[PDB]
Amino acid sequence: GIQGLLQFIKEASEPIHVRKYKGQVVAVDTYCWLHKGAIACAEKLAKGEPTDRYVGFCMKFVNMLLSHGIKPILVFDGCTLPSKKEVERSRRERRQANLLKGKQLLREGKVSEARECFTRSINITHAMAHKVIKAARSQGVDCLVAPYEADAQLAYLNKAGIVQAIITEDSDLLAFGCKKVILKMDQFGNGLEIDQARLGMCRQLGDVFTEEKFRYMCILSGCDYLSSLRGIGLAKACKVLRLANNPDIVKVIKKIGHYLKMNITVPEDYINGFIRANNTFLYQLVFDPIKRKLIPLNAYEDDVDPETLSYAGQYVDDSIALQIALGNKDINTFEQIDDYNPDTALYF
DNA sequence: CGCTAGTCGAC
DNA sequence: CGACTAGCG
Ligand SMILES: [Mn+2]
Ligand SMILES: [Mn+2]
Ligand SMILES: [Mn+2]
Ligand code: NA
């Protein structure tokens, strides 16, 4: 989650409509619709009571995309990436804390505060996601569960040419290298569009419109993989990459004080963490729908060594990866919950 | 000015 | 898993 990236490159945005992508294919970060739909029924989820409103909430958007002649591909989150496990456990503690706090505020009579706390404790399980999967497949909509983050999966789908745009609310997709990203889309088809090619319209960027420099900037600003240094944000990082001509990022980071004229002390931890975050943004494991195989987001460069990228995701057998991608296999228990087969009728 | 961190919407 | 803004370098 690049803190305030949208406001920073606002000059590259454009109010559009989904009708623009008629006859084409788009992929959706379904967690957004799932979350927003889960907000509507927070109490039943917090109490464990049966509910199915978020499903219809997703199906509204889905039926809209279908009505405007668009081909949607719902992408869901899979396994938890080790690089973002600290934040994961943080939210894991916070949601349970807010859960118990909600259960306690339920006894004080303050129902509004209890619901307000039940809203900030929403946990999107893979069972709900699976419900959305089956419900979407009922309408003939192709689904795909990412081996890890849905961000990398959507990124691959957009960069490979399977889809032409990505529907989401997360600006991380821009740092992954998505060509076109649709944001702020309502249930009618009204949203914003941030095109990569139009990043040059942002004067505040300068010569930082290339994918590599944009990535470096996003990481230096502080991502979900590596926390930024105390005092460094988007503008100062952009300034660093603007005033620097050296392609080797390591020396640049080592002289970040020389570029910004600030007494900045850079630990080795932040260097290794930077290389780590970069390798996570570049070579995170995704799943090829057509060839049915676990692949990195981008082709392995000569300067990198795949054996030292466990944090970017661990490899498993492609059959298991297929069973996870289809949603037949549970993400946690690794047990077979469903038995869907695309061979009996995206993948083809 | 730019950035940290707290804060409140979403439905 | 954002947007807005007070407090601060
Ligand atoms: Mn994020
Ligand atoms: Mn995500
Ligand atoms: Mn993300
Ligand atoms: Na920052």
mmCIF file of C-alpha atoms (C1' of nucleotides) and ligand atoms in Angstrom:
data_model
loop_
_atom_site.group_PDB
_atom_site.id
_atom_site.type_symbol
_atom_site.label_atom_id
_atom_site.label_comp_id
_atom_site.label_asym_id
_atom_site.label_seq_id
_atom_site.Cartn_x
_atom_site.Cartn_y
_atom_site.Cartn_z
ATOM 1 C CA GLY A 1 0.000 0.000 0.000
ATOM 2 C CA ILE A 2 1.966 2.961 -1.327
ATOM 3 C CA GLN A 3 0.946 5.729 1.138
ATOM 4 C CA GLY A 4 -0.699 8.444 -0.953
ATOM 5 C CA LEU A 5 0.443 7.347 -4.403
ATOM 6 C CA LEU A 6 -2.859 8.219 -6.084
ATOM 7 C CA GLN A 7 -2.731 11.843 -4.944
ATOM 8 C CA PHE A 8 0.903 12.030 -6.047
ATOM 9 C CA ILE A 9 0.277 10.991 -9.660
ATOM 10 C CA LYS A 10 -3.218 12.498 -9.870
ATOM 11 C CA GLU A 11 -2.190 14.223 -13.106
ATOM 12 C CA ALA A 12 -2.069 10.808 -14.787
ATOM 13 C CA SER A 13 -5.631 9.909 -13.803
ATOM 14 C CA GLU A 14 -8.729 10.052 -16.004
ATOM 15 C CA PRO A 15 -12.445 9.696 -15.138
ATOM 16 C CA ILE A 16 -13.809 6.974 -17.427
ATOM 17 C CA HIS A 17 -16.496 4.307 -17.729
ATOM 18 C CA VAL A 18 -16.218 0.512 -18.044
ATOM 19 C CA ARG A 19 -18.028 0.769 -21.388
ATOM 20 C CA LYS A 20 -14.634 1.861 -22.736
ATOM 21 C CA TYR A 21 -13.413 -1.732 -22.429
ATOM 22 C CA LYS A 22 -16.290 -3.326 -24.352
ATOM 23 C CA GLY A 23 -15.392 -6.587 -26.082
ATOM 24 C CA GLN A 24 -12.213 -6.853 -24.034
ATOM 25 C CA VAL A 25 -11.106 -8.721 -20.911
ATOM 26 C CA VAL A 26 -10.530 -7.270 -17.437
ATOM 27 C CA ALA A 27 -9.360 -8.844 -14.174
ATOM 28 C CA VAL A 28 -10.662 -7.924 -10.724
ATOM 29 C CA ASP A 29 -9.067 -7.734 -7.287
ATOM 30 C CA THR A 30 -12.135 -9.404 -5.786
ATOM 31 C CA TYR A 31 -10.984 -8.771 -2.207
ATOM 32 C CA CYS A 32 -12.202 -5.189 -2.563
ATOM 33 C CA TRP A 33 -15.788 -6.108 -3.413
ATOM 34 C CA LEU A 34 -15.574 -8.895 -0.841
ATOM 35 C CA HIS A 35 -14.517 -6.461 1.877
ATOM 36 C CA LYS A 36 -17.044 -3.760 0.982
ATOM 37 C CA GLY A 37 -19.722 -6.449 0.872
ATOM 38 C CA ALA A 38 -18.523 -7.773 4.220
ATOM 39 C CA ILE A 39 -18.982 -4.313 5.730
ATOM 40 C CA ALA A 40 -22.732 -4.522 5.057
ATOM 41 C CA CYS A 41 -23.029 -7.619 7.256
ATOM 42 C CA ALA A 42 -20.368 -7.156 9.936
ATOM 43 C CA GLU A 43 -22.437 -8.329 12.910
ATOM 44 C CA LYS A 44 -23.307 -11.751 11.469
ATOM 45 C CA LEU A 45 -19.658 -12.307 10.549
ATOM 46 C CA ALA A 46 -18.465 -11.193 13.981
ATOM 47 C CA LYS A 47 -20.994 -13.446 15.720
ATOM 48 C CA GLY A 48 -20.444 -16.336 13.311
ATOM 49 C CA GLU A 49 -24.055 -16.153 12.150
ATOM 50 C CA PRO A 50 -24.865 -17.370 8.607
ATOM 51 C CA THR A 51 -24.865 -14.655 5.931
ATOM 52 C CA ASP A 52 -24.641 -14.322 2.140
ATOM 53 C CA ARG A 53 -24.965 -10.607 1.345
ATOM 54 C CA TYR A 54 -21.369 -9.985 0.239
ATOM 55 C CA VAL A 55 -21.891 -12.612 -2.463
ATOM 56 C CA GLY A 56 -24.743 -10.630 -3.995
ATOM 57 C CA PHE A 57 -22.694 -7.477 -3.489
ATOM 58 C CA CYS A 58 -19.960 -8.953 -5.681
ATOM 59 C CA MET A 59 -22.527 -10.301 -8.139
ATOM 60 C CA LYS A 60 -23.859 -6.771 -8.642
ATOM 61 C CA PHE A 61 -20.502 -5.607 -10.004
ATOM 62 C CA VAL A 62 -20.075 -8.888 -11.886
ATOM 63 C CA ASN A 63 -23.502 -8.631 -13.532
ATOM 64 C CA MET A 64 -22.693 -5.012 -14.379
ATOM 65 C CA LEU A 65 -19.454 -5.973 -16.124
ATOM 66 C CA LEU A 66 -21.397 -8.694 -17.934
ATOM 67 C CA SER A 67 -24.116 -6.206 -18.904
ATOM 68 C CA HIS A 68 -21.585 -3.809 -20.420
ATOM 69 C CA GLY A 69 -20.123 -6.628 -22.514
ATOM 70 C CA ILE A 70 -16.948 -7.028 -20.471
ATOM 71 C CA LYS A 71 -15.218 -10.317 -19.633
ATOM 72 C CA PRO A 72 -14.338 -10.365 -15.907
ATOM 73 C CA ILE A 73 -11.762 -12.672 -14.326
ATOM 74 C CA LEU A 74 -12.124 -12.755 -10.544
ATOM 75 C CA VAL A 75 -8.760 -13.115 -8.811
ATOM 76 C CA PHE A 76 -8.496 -14.066 -5.136
ATOM 77 C CA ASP A 77 -5.750 -14.054 -2.506
ATOM 78 C CA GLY A 78 -3.959 -17.303 -1.716
ATOM 79 C CA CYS A 79 -1.152 -18.098 0.711
ATOM 80 C CA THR A 80 0.381 -15.461 2.977
ATOM 81 C CA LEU A 81 3.688 -14.070 1.727
ATOM 82 C CA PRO A 82 6.500 -14.307 4.331
ATOM 83 C CA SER A 83 7.692 -10.811 3.366
ATOM 84 C CA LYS A 84 4.411 -9.384 4.666
ATOM 85 C CA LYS A 85 3.898 -11.635 7.686
ATOM 86 C CA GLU A 86 4.612 -9.020 10.352
ATOM 87 C CA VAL A 87 1.787 -6.820 9.069
ATOM 88 C CA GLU A 88 -0.312 -9.965 8.642
ATOM 89 C CA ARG A 89 0.082 -10.984 12.284
ATOM 90 C CA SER A 90 -0.410 -7.347 13.291
ATOM 91 C CA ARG A 91 -3.813 -7.205 11.595
ATOM 92 C CA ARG A 92 -4.441 -10.712 12.944
ATOM 93 C CA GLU A 93 -4.042 -9.439 16.506
ATOM 94 C CA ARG A 94 -5.911 -6.192 15.851
ATOM 95 C CA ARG A 95 -8.982 -7.917 14.391
ATOM 96 C CA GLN A 96 -9.325 -10.258 17.379
ATOM 97 C CA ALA A 97 -8.692 -7.404 19.804
ATOM 98 C CA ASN A 98 -11.415 -5.369 18.099
ATOM 99 C CA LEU A 99 -13.572 -8.504 18.136
ATOM 100 C CA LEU A 100 -13.372 -8.899 21.915
ATOM 101 C CA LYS A 101 -13.706 -5.131 22.354
ATOM 102 C CA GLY A 102 -16.851 -5.323 20.238
ATOM 103 C CA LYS A 103 -18.191 -8.182 22.340
ATOM 104 C CA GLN A 104 -17.525 -6.058 25.428
ATOM 105 C CA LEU A 105 -19.133 -2.931 23.968
ATOM 106 C CA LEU A 106 -22.113 -5.124 23.093
ATOM 107 C CA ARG A 107 -22.765 -5.389 26.835
ATOM 108 C CA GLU A 108 -22.469 -1.660 27.566
ATOM 109 C CA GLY A 109 -25.509 -0.845 25.436
ATOM 110 C CA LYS A 110 -23.515 1.212 22.945
ATOM 111 C CA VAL A 111 -24.620 -0.708 19.854
ATOM 112 C CA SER A 112 -23.285 1.905 17.421
ATOM 113 C CA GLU A 113 -19.776 1.696 18.874
ATOM 114 C CA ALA A 114 -20.030 -2.099 18.887
ATOM 115 C CA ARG A 115 -20.842 -2.091 15.171
ATOM 116 C CA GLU A 116 -18.099 0.471 14.570
ATOM 117 C CA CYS A 117 -15.683 -1.969 16.212
ATOM 118 C CA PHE A 118 -17.183 -4.931 14.353
ATOM 119 C CA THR A 119 -16.437 -3.053 11.130
ATOM 120 C CA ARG A 120 -12.726 -2.760 11.926
ATOM 121 C CA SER A 121 -12.478 -6.474 12.728
ATOM 122 C CA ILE A 122 -13.707 -7.926 9.435
ATOM 123 C CA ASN A 123 -11.833 -11.089 8.475
ATOM 124 C CA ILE A 124 -12.204 -12.316 4.894
ATOM 125 C CA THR A 125 -11.913 -16.108 5.047
ATOM 126 C CA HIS A 126 -11.270 -18.370 2.055
ATOM 127 C CA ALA A 127 -14.675 -19.970 2.615
ATOM 128 C CA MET A 128 -16.428 -16.705 1.757
ATOM 129 C CA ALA A 129 -14.090 -16.272 -1.198
ATOM 130 C CA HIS A 130 -14.990 -19.803 -2.284
ATOM 131 C CA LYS A 131 -18.688 -18.949 -2.032
ATOM 132 C CA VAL A 132 -18.019 -16.006 -4.334
ATOM 133 C CA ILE A 133 -16.077 -18.356 -6.632
ATOM 134 C CA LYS A 134 -18.927 -20.853 -6.997
ATOM 135 C CA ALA A 135 -21.521 -18.084 -7.299
ATOM 136 C CA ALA A 136 -19.479 -16.425 -10.051
ATOM 137 C CA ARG A 137 -18.898 -19.717 -11.859
ATOM 138 C CA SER A 138 -22.677 -20.132 -11.811
ATOM 139 C CA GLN A 139 -22.759 -17.218 -14.264
ATOM 140 C CA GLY A 140 -19.895 -18.683 -16.285
ATOM 141 C CA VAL A 141 -17.318 -16.249 -14.914
ATOM 142 C CA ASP A 142 -13.754 -17.583 -14.834
ATOM 143 C CA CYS A 143 -11.976 -17.465 -11.471
ATOM 144 C CA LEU A 144 -8.340 -17.762 -10.408
ATOM 145 C CA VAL A 145 -6.848 -18.049 -6.928
ATOM 146 C CA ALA A 146 -3.334 -16.611 -6.805
ATOM 147 C CA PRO A 147 -0.594 -18.766 -5.236
ATOM 148 C CA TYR A 148 0.046 -15.789 -2.952
ATOM 149 C CA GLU A 149 -0.837 -12.111 -3.396
ATOM 150 C CA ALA A 150 -3.558 -11.278 -5.910
ATOM 151 C CA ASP A 151 -1.544 -8.153 -6.732
ATOM 152 C CA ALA A 152 1.225 -10.096 -8.476
ATOM 153 C CA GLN A 153 -1.313 -12.324 -10.219
ATOM 154 C CA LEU A 154 -3.269 -9.380 -11.636
ATOM 155 C CA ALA A 155 0.049 -7.791 -12.606
ATOM 156 C CA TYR A 156 0.997 -10.896 -14.579
ATOM 157 C CA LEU A 157 -2.429 -11.103 -16.225
ATOM 158 C CA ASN A 158 -2.128 -7.477 -17.343
ATOM 159 C CA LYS A 159 1.496 -7.672 -18.494
ATOM 160 C CA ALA A 160 1.057 -10.985 -20.330
ATOM 161 C CA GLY A 161 -1.857 -9.622 -22.345
ATOM 162 C CA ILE A 162 -4.641 -11.806 -20.969
ATOM 163 C CA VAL A 163 -6.471 -8.750 -19.637
ATOM 164 C CA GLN A 164 -6.353 -5.102 -20.718
ATOM 165 C CA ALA A 165 -7.201 -3.470 -17.389
ATOM 166 C CA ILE A 166 -7.212 -4.192 -13.655
ATOM 167 C CA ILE A 167 -10.110 -3.317 -11.358
ATOM 168 C CA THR A 168 -8.936 -2.664 -7.803
ATOM 169 C CA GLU A 169 -8.663 -0.125 -4.990
ATOM 170 C CA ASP A 170 -5.028 -0.869 -4.162
ATOM 171 C CA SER A 171 -2.327 1.329 -5.713
ATOM 172 C CA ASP A 172 0.235 -1.450 -5.272
ATOM 173 C CA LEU A 173 -0.705 -2.697 -8.747
ATOM 174 C CA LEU A 174 0.982 0.383 -10.214
ATOM 175 C CA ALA A 175 4.292 -0.556 -8.588
ATOM 176 C CA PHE A 176 3.995 -4.115 -9.916
ATOM 177 C CA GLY A 177 3.882 -2.733 -13.450
ATOM 178 C CA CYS A 178 0.234 -2.712 -14.510
ATOM 179 C CA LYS A 179 -0.473 -0.885 -17.772
ATOM 180 C CA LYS A 180 -4.017 0.231 -16.946
ATOM 181 C CA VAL A 181 -5.605 0.317 -13.489
ATOM 182 C CA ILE A 182 -9.240 1.178 -12.785
ATOM 183 C CA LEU A 183 -9.855 2.679 -9.342
ATOM 184 C CA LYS A 184 -12.820 4.111 -7.411
ATOM 185 C CA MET A 185 -15.283 2.143 -9.543
ATOM 186 C CA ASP A 186 -18.865 2.226 -8.273
ATOM 187 C CA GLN A 187 -21.640 -0.290 -8.937
ATOM 188 C CA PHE A 188 -22.591 1.534 -12.145
ATOM 189 C CA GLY A 189 -19.225 1.596 -13.904
ATOM 190 C CA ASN A 190 -17.876 5.010 -12.935
ATOM 191 C CA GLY A 191 -14.219 4.981 -11.913
ATOM 192 C CA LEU A 192 -10.774 6.500 -12.397
ATOM 193 C CA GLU A 193 -8.098 5.230 -14.777
ATOM 194 C CA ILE A 194 -4.357 5.456 -14.178
ATOM 195 C CA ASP A 195 -2.425 4.553 -17.326
ATOM 196 C CA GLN A 196 1.305 3.860 -17.060
ATOM 197 C CA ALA A 197 2.047 5.609 -20.360
ATOM 198 C CA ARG A 198 0.391 8.744 -18.980
ATOM 199 C CA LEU A 199 2.667 8.802 -15.915
ATOM 200 C CA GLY A 200 4.707 11.290 -17.926
ATOM 201 C CA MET A 201 1.956 13.855 -17.396
ATOM 202 C CA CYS A 202 3.156 14.126 -13.796
ATOM 203 C CA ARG A 203 5.696 16.959 -13.705
ATOM 204 C CA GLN A 204 6.315 16.165 -10.037
ATOM 205 C CA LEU A 205 7.847 12.853 -11.140
ATOM 206 C CA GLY A 206 10.374 14.164 -13.653
ATOM 207 C CA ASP A 207 12.417 11.380 -15.229
ATOM 208 C CA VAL A 208 10.872 8.861 -12.832
ATOM 209 C CA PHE A 209 8.223 7.450 -15.168
ATOM 210 C CA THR A 210 10.115 4.288 -16.088
ATOM 211 C CA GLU A 211 8.927 1.067 -14.442
ATOM 212 C CA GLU A 212 12.218 0.417 -12.640
ATOM 213 C CA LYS A 213 12.610 3.913 -11.182
ATOM 214 C CA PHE A 214 8.904 3.980 -10.319
ATOM 215 C CA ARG A 215 9.372 0.693 -8.458
ATOM 216 C CA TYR A 216 12.430 2.013 -6.614
ATOM 217 C CA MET A 217 10.480 5.130 -5.643
ATOM 218 C CA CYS A 218 7.486 3.140 -4.411
ATOM 219 C CA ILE A 219 9.745 0.935 -2.293
ATOM 220 C CA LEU A 220 11.722 3.882 -0.891
ATOM 221 C CA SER A 221 8.458 5.588 0.070
ATOM 222 C CA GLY A 222 7.514 2.588 2.194
ATOM 223 C CA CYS A 223 5.628 -0.491 1.011
ATOM 224 C CA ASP A 224 4.044 -3.519 2.684
ATOM 225 C CA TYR A 225 7.373 -5.334 2.395
ATOM 226 C CA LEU A 226 9.834 -2.769 3.750
ATOM 227 C CA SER A 227 9.080 0.122 6.099
ATOM 228 C CA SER A 228 10.521 3.445 4.939
ATOM 229 C CA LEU A 229 13.246 5.336 6.784
ATOM 230 C CA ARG A 230 12.113 7.929 9.328
ATOM 231 C CA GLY A 231 11.689 11.000 7.136
ATOM 232 C CA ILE A 232 11.578 9.538 3.629
ATOM 233 C CA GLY A 233 8.357 9.634 1.618
ATOM 234 C CA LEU A 234 7.287 9.756 -2.026
ATOM 235 C CA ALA A 235 8.610 13.234 -2.836
ATOM 236 C CA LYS A 236 12.054 12.788 -1.273
ATOM 237 C CA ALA A 237 12.490 9.370 -2.904
ATOM 238 C CA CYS A 238 11.441 10.835 -6.243
ATOM 239 C CA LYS A 239 14.013 13.571 -5.628
ATOM 240 C CA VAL A 240 16.640 10.913 -4.908
ATOM 241 C CA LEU A 241 15.947 9.078 -8.164
ATOM 242 C CA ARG A 242 15.728 12.396 -10.012
ATOM 243 C CA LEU A 243 19.089 13.767 -8.882
ATOM 244 C CA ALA A 244 20.738 10.363 -9.309
ATOM 245 C CA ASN A 245 22.113 9.172 -12.641
ATOM 246 C CA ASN A 246 23.664 5.976 -11.282
ATOM 247 C CA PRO A 247 21.667 2.933 -12.488
ATOM 248 C CA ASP A 248 23.003 0.852 -9.589
ATOM 249 C CA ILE A 249 20.482 1.566 -6.831
ATOM 250 C CA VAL A 250 22.711 0.309 -3.995
ATOM 251 C CA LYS A 251 25.278 3.121 -4.189
ATOM 252 C CA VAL A 252 22.425 5.608 -4.558
ATOM 253 C CA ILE A 253 20.785 4.406 -1.344
ATOM 254 C CA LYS A 254 24.201 4.468 0.326
ATOM 255 C CA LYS A 255 24.492 8.116 -0.740
ATOM 256 C CA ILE A 256 20.850 9.000 -0.039
ATOM 257 C CA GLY A 257 22.239 11.588 2.371
ATOM 258 C CA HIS A 258 24.451 12.949 -0.398
ATOM 259 C CA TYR A 259 21.478 13.310 -2.745
ATOM 260 C CA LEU A 260 19.072 14.878 -0.229
ATOM 261 C CA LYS A 261 21.648 16.762 1.870
ATOM 262 C CA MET A 262 20.411 15.172 5.101
ATOM 263 C CA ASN A 263 22.416 13.367 7.781
ATOM 264 C CA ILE A 264 20.854 10.006 6.922
ATOM 265 C CA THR A 265 22.230 6.817 8.468
ATOM 266 C CA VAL A 266 21.453 3.709 6.421
ATOM 267 C CA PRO A 267 21.751 0.321 8.194
ATOM 268 C CA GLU A 268 22.619 -2.882 6.318
ATOM 269 C CA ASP A 269 19.191 -4.146 7.377
ATOM 270 C CA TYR A 270 17.532 -1.587 5.116
ATOM 271 C CA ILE A 271 19.824 -2.476 2.210
ATOM 272 C CA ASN A 272 19.145 -6.202 2.418
ATOM 273 C CA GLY A 273 15.515 -5.322 3.075
ATOM 274 C CA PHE A 274 15.510 -3.157 -0.042
ATOM 275 C CA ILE A 275 16.939 -5.885 -2.258
ATOM 276 C CA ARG A 276 14.396 -8.194 -0.626
ATOM 277 C CA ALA A 277 11.471 -5.872 -1.374
ATOM 278 C CA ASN A 278 12.662 -5.339 -4.948
ATOM 279 C CA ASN A 279 12.969 -9.083 -5.536
ATOM 280 C CA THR A 280 9.495 -9.465 -4.035
ATOM 281 C CA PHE A 281 8.057 -6.844 -6.394
ATOM 282 C CA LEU A 282 9.836 -8.401 -9.373
ATOM 283 C CA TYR A 283 9.981 -12.168 -8.951
ATOM 284 C CA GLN A 284 6.947 -13.098 -6.849
ATOM 285 C CA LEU A 285 5.404 -16.428 -7.849
ATOM 286 C CA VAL A 286 2.275 -16.368 -10.006
ATOM 287 C CA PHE A 287 0.254 -18.970 -11.907
ATOM 288 C CA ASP A 288 0.067 -19.142 -15.703
ATOM 289 C CA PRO A 289 -3.565 -19.959 -16.608
ATOM 290 C CA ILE A 290 -2.741 -21.204 -20.112
ATOM 291 C CA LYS A 291 0.389 -23.278 -19.472
ATOM 292 C CA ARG A 292 -0.655 -24.254 -15.926
ATOM 293 C CA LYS A 293 2.653 -23.741 -14.111
ATOM 294 C CA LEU A 294 4.079 -21.694 -11.234
ATOM 295 C CA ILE A 295 6.211 -18.891 -12.660
ATOM 296 C CA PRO A 296 7.787 -15.686 -11.333
ATOM 297 C CA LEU A 297 6.090 -12.372 -12.156
ATOM 298 C CA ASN A 298 8.982 -11.538 -14.479
ATOM 299 C CA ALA A 299 11.710 -13.613 -16.131
ATOM 300 C CA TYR A 300 14.696 -14.235 -13.854
ATOM 301 C CA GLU A 301 17.492 -11.799 -14.697
ATOM 302 C CA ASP A 302 21.147 -12.847 -14.734
ATOM 303 C CA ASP A 303 21.961 -10.787 -11.642
ATOM 304 C CA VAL A 304 19.481 -12.674 -9.453
ATOM 305 C CA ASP A 305 19.588 -16.178 -7.962
ATOM 306 C CA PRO A 306 16.221 -18.013 -7.614
ATOM 307 C CA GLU A 307 17.478 -20.178 -4.729
ATOM 308 C CA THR A 308 17.589 -17.121 -2.463
ATOM 309 C CA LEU A 309 14.007 -16.015 -3.115
ATOM 310 C CA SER A 310 12.053 -18.070 -0.577
ATOM 311 C CA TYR A 311 10.426 -14.902 0.759
ATOM 312 C CA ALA A 312 9.100 -14.252 -2.746
ATOM 313 C CA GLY A 313 7.216 -17.541 -2.512
ATOM 314 C CA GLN A 314 8.004 -21.248 -2.328
ATOM 315 C CA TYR A 315 7.528 -23.601 -5.283
ATOM 316 C CA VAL A 316 5.155 -26.567 -5.220
ATOM 317 C CA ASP A 317 4.130 -29.171 -7.800
ATOM 318 C CA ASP A 318 2.154 -27.640 -10.675
ATOM 319 C CA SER A 319 -0.761 -30.027 -10.101
ATOM 320 C CA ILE A 320 -1.187 -28.757 -6.545
ATOM 321 C CA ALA A 321 -0.809 -25.203 -7.839
ATOM 322 C CA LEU A 322 -3.580 -25.932 -10.334
ATOM 323 C CA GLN A 323 -5.820 -27.360 -7.609
ATOM 324 C CA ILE A 324 -5.206 -24.239 -5.518
ATOM 325 C CA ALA A 325 -5.753 -21.867 -8.443
ATOM 326 C CA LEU A 326 -9.100 -23.468 -9.286
ATOM 327 C CA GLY A 327 -10.119 -23.171 -5.639
ATOM 328 C CA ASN A 328 -10.646 -26.905 -5.198
ATOM 329 C CA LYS A 329 -7.895 -27.114 -2.590
ATOM 330 C CA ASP A 330 -7.956 -25.206 0.696
ATOM 331 C CA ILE A 331 -5.239 -22.596 1.211
ATOM 332 C CA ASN A 332 -4.602 -23.510 4.847
ATOM 333 C CA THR A 333 -5.562 -27.142 5.459
ATOM 334 C CA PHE A 334 -4.480 -28.082 1.915
ATOM 335 C CA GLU A 335 -7.471 -30.441 1.798
ATOM 336 C CA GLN A 336 -9.811 -30.900 -1.163
ATOM 337 C CA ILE A 337 -12.997 -28.895 -0.609
ATOM 338 C CA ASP A 338 -14.289 -28.831 -4.185
ATOM 339 C CA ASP A 339 -13.706 -30.691 -7.455
ATOM 340 C CA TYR A 340 -14.104 -28.201 -10.308
ATOM 341 C CA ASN A 341 -12.600 -29.078 -13.691
ATOM 342 C CA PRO A 342 -12.240 -26.669 -16.649
ATOM 343 C CA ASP A 343 -11.427 -29.628 -18.911
ATOM 344 C CA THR A 344 -15.053 -30.749 -18.669
ATOM 345 C CA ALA A 345 -16.951 -28.189 -20.747
ATOM 346 C CA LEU A 346 -9.625 -18.837 -19.557
ATOM 347 C CA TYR A 347 -7.503 -21.980 -19.278
ATOM 348 C CA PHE A 348 -8.661 -24.084 -22.244
ATOM 349 C "C1'" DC B 1 6.722 23.318 1.908
ATOM 350 C "C1'" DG B 2 7.035 17.436 2.977
ATOM 351 C "C1'" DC B 3 6.190 13.596 6.146
ATOM 352 C "C1'" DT B 4 4.771 10.931 10.257
ATOM 353 C "C1'" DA B 5 0.831 9.045 12.457
ATOM 354 C "C1'" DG B 6 -3.579 9.207 14.101
ATOM 355 C "C1'" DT B 7 -8.354 9.102 12.505
ATOM 356 C "C1'" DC B 8 -12.837 7.927 10.233
ATOM 357 C "C1'" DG B 9 -15.425 6.274 5.918
ATOM 358 C "C1'" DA B 10 -17.093 1.954 3.445
ATOM 359 C "C1'" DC B 11 -22.341 -0.609 3.495
ATOM 360 C "C1'" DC C 1 -6.854 -3.259 3.495
ATOM 361 C "C1'" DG C 2 -7.636 4.711 1.766
ATOM 362 C "C1'" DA C 3 -8.504 9.734 2.524
ATOM 363 C "C1'" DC C 4 -7.776 13.584 5.420
ATOM 364 C "C1'" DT C 5 -5.059 16.439 8.505
ATOM 365 C "C1'" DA C 6 -2.720 18.119 12.700
ATOM 366 C "C1'" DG C 7 1.945 18.418 14.473
ATOM 367 C "C1'" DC C 8 6.693 18.838 13.036
ATOM 368 C "C1'" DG C 9 11.422 18.950 10.465
HETATM 369 MN MN MN D 1 -0.981 -2.398 0.109
HETATM 370 MN MN MN D 2 -3.739 -7.380 -2.319
HETATM 371 MN MN MN D 3 -1.260 -4.733 -2.053
HETATM 372 NA NA NA D 4 7.351 7.239 3.708
#
